[PDB]
Design a protein around this ligand. Sequence first.
Ligand SMILES: NC(=O)c1ccc[n+]([C@@H]2O[C@H](COP(=O)([O-])OP(=O)(O)OC[C@H]3O[C@@H](n4cnc5c(N)ncnc54)[C@H](OP(=O)(O)O)[C@@H]3O)[C@@H](O)[C@H]2O)c1
Ligand SMILES: NC(=O)c1ccc[n+]([C@@H]2O[C@H](COP(=O)([O-])OP(=O)(O)OC[C@H]3O[C@@H](n4cnc5c(N)ncnc54)[C@H](OP(=O)(O)O)[C@@H]3O)[C@@H](O)[C@H]2O)c1
Ligand code: NA
Lengths: 357, 359
Amino acid sequence: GYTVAVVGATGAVGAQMIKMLEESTLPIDKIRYLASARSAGKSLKFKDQDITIEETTETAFEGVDIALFSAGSSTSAKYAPYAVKAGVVVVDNTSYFRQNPDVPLVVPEVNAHALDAHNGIIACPNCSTIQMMVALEPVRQKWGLDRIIVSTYQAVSGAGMGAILETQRELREVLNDGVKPCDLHAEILPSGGDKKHYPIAFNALPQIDVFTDNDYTYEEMKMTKETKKIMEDDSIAVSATCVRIPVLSAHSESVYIETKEVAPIEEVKAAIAAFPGAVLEDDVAHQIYPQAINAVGSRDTFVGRIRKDLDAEKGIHMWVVSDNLLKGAAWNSVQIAETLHERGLVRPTAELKFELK
Amino acid sequence: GYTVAVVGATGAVGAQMIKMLEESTLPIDKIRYLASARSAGKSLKFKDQDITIEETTETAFEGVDIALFSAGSSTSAKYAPYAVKAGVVVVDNTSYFRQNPDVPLVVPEVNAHALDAHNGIIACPNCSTIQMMVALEPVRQKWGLDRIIVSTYQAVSGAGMGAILETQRELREVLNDGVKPCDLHAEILPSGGDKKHYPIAFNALPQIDVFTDNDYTYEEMKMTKETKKIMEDDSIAVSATCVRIPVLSAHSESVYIETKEVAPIEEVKAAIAAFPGAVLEDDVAHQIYPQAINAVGSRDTFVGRIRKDLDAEKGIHMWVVSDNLLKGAAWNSVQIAETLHERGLVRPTAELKFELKLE
Ligand SMILES: NC(=O)c1ccc[n+]([C@@H]2O[C@H](COP(=O)([O-])OP(=O)(O)OC[C@H]3O[C@@H](n4cnc5c(N)ncnc54)[C@H](OP(=O)(O)O)[C@@H]3O)[C@@H](O)[C@H]2O)c1
Ligand SMILES: NC(=O)c1ccc[n+]([C@@H]2O[C@H](COP(=O)([O-])OP(=O)(O)OC[C@H]3O[C@@H](n4cnc5c(N)ncnc54)[C@H](OP(=O)(O)O)[C@@H]3O)[C@@H](O)[C@H]2O)c1
Ligand code: NA
C-alpha cells in the first residue's frame, strides 16, 4: 500500500481529510499527520490507532507516496516542492498552484483526464467553484455554456476553524447577552488577512478573501478563472458575487447560465440527475430543493430550483448546495487520490518543475 | 390634524409603523390601533399615551382619515374597501391590491406622480422590490434598463413576528442545547401557509411565499411584476431567486443589471449617491460595503460592490441592503402618507372601485 501524509491535519479541512481517508478504499500502509511546530508531539486518531503529529519541514517527506496539503498557501508554497523532490504526489487544497500551467486543476467527474500528465502536484479548486462545476458539466456536455452569473451563500467553515468559533461566540453574545449585532467585536471575518473585521452574526458579508484591482474579490475571480481552466474553455463568461452568511457548514449558490443551444428543462433535470456526484433534489410541488443543513455530511452536490429564465431564451436558473469541507475540499482531494491510484499515477516525478523556496 | 388607524398594530410591521408615525411630521389628532380578536382589549403605547387595541370590523373606520394596513392579504381584501367607502385613504402593505389598475403602486422617490389619481387605496410594493427600485431608478433615468437578475438574502422578519421568534428559538437550541440543525422542529418557515416547514437556523431556504405554476415562487414573480408597474415599463426583463437566510432584520440583494447604454461605474456611483433615499457605501480599499447589521434602524437604502460585468459591456453588479420593516414596509407607508399630505391628497374618494366582500 501507500504511505499517506496529511499536512494541516489539525485544521477544519484536515479533520475532514482524516474522516475521508478513514472511509476511503485507498490501500494505506502508513499514515502520518503533519502540522506546525505547536502541534508537534500531540496525538490524533486514525480509526482506532494513535498517530503522533509531526512538524512540517523540508526533510519530512521521505518515504511518502501521497501528501494531502491543507495548511494555507504559505505552507504549500514552501514545502510542496520539497515533497515532489522526495518522490511524493501532492494533492493541494490551497490556491497557490491552481493557475500554474504545469499543475492540473481537477474535479474528478469533470476533468480526470488532466491527471494523466501531472508533474507531482494536483490542485484542488476552490470549494465554491467545485460544486458549481459538478452541477454545470452535464449541462455543458449536451447544450454548451455561453455565460455564468453566480451569487454565493457561503458557510463560515470556509474561512477555517477560527471563523466557526468566532461565528458561534458572536451569535451567543447576541442571543444570550443581548448585544446588538452591529456592536459585536470581530477578529477574523470577512478575511483574516485583511485590515478590518466585521461581525457575521445576523449579517451577510459581501466579501470573501481580499479585493483585487478590478473591485472583485479574489474569491469571485477564482470562480471565474478556475471555471475556465477546469472546463478548458476561456470563452465561457463568468462573473460572481461571493457572500458570507451565518451558516457553519455547506455552501449554497444561486446560479444563472445561458447555454449555446436551448436546453429543455426536463432534459436538464435528467442530465444533472444522471451525472456522477450530482443529485437532483427538485420537486417544488412537495417543496423539495437543496438545503445547506441536509447537505452537511454528504459527498454529493445537490441541485434544484431548476427553471428557465422568464425572458432569455437560453437562460436557466438553479440552486446548488454542497458541503464545503467535503466535495468542496477533503472529499475532492481523497477522490483525486483514489483516481490517481486507479490510473497508476501514484509514482515519483523525474522532472522537477517547481522551484525550491 | 388627521385621525390615523394602524391595522395590524401588534405585528412585526405594525410595531415599526408605530415607531415611524411617532417620528413623523404628520399632524395626528387621533391614533387608533386595530388588529384581530386575539389582540382586542390589549394596550399599546403611542409615545406616552395608552391606546386600547380594537378588533378590525367593516364598521371600524368611521371618522378615520388615513388607514395603514399591514395585517395580511385577507384582512386588506375584507376591510380596505369598507374603509374607502367610509371616506378613508388606505395605504396597504399587502400584495392584494398591488396589481390592480385602479391602485397606485408607489415608492415615493420613484413614482410619487402616480399618487395624484388614487382611488382611495395606495399599495406599498413587496419589501424586496422597494429597495431594488431605490437603487436602480437613478441608473434607469440616465442609462435605461434592459434586464435585471436578482438573488436575494432575505431576513426572517419578512415572514412576521412568529418567524422572528422561531428563528431565535432554533438558534438558541443549537448554540445552547447542542441540538443538530437537522433535528430542529419548524412550524412557520419557509412559508406559514404552505404544507411543509423547515429549519432556518444555519440554513438557506430558496423558498419565500408559495410556488406558482411556472416553478418560480410568488415572491420571485412579485419582484418581476411589481418592477414593471413601478417603473412603468413592461419591457424590462426581470428574473429573481428569493432566499431566506438566518438574519432577523434587513434584506440584502445581489443585483445584476444590463443598461440600454454603457453606464460608467464612477458615474453610476455618483448617480446613486445623489438619489433621494439611496446612500452610497462603496469604498473597497477600506472594505466599505452595505451590511444588513448596519442598515437596521435606518430609513435609507444602501448600495455598494458596484462594478461592471467581466464580459457584458452594459452589465453591472451591485449589492443592495435595506431594513425590510422600514423602507421595505413601515417607512415606505409613512412616507406615502406624508407625500399624500404634501399634495393635499388625504380626502374621501367619491366613486367606489373596489368590491365589498362582507355584504
Ligand atoms: N475551509 C474550507 O471550506 C476550504 C475549502 C477549500 C480549500 N480550503 C483551503 O485549505 C486550507 C486550510 O483551510 P482550513 O479551513 O483547514 O484552515 P484552518 O482551520 O485554519 O487550519 C489550518 C491548518 O494549517 C496548519 N498550519 C498552519 N501553519 C502551518 C505551517 N507553517 N506548517 C504546517 N502546518 C501549518 C495548522 O496547523 P496548527 O494547528 O499546528 O497551527 C492547521 O491544521 C486553506 O488554504 C484554504 O484556502 C479550505
Ligand atoms: N414583514 C415584512 O418585512 C413585510 C414587508 C412588506 C409587507 N409585509 C406585509 O405585511 C403584512 C403583515 O406584516 P407582518 O410581517 O408584521 O406580520 P405579523 O407579524 O405576523 O403580524 C400580522 C398582523 O396582522 C394582524 N391580523 C391577523 N389577522 C387579522 C384579522 N383577521 N383582522 C385584523 N388583523 C389581523 C395581527 O393581529 P393579532 O396580533 O391580533 O393577531 C398582526 O398584528 C403581510 O401581509 C405582509 O405581506 C410585510
Ligand atoms: Na447523479
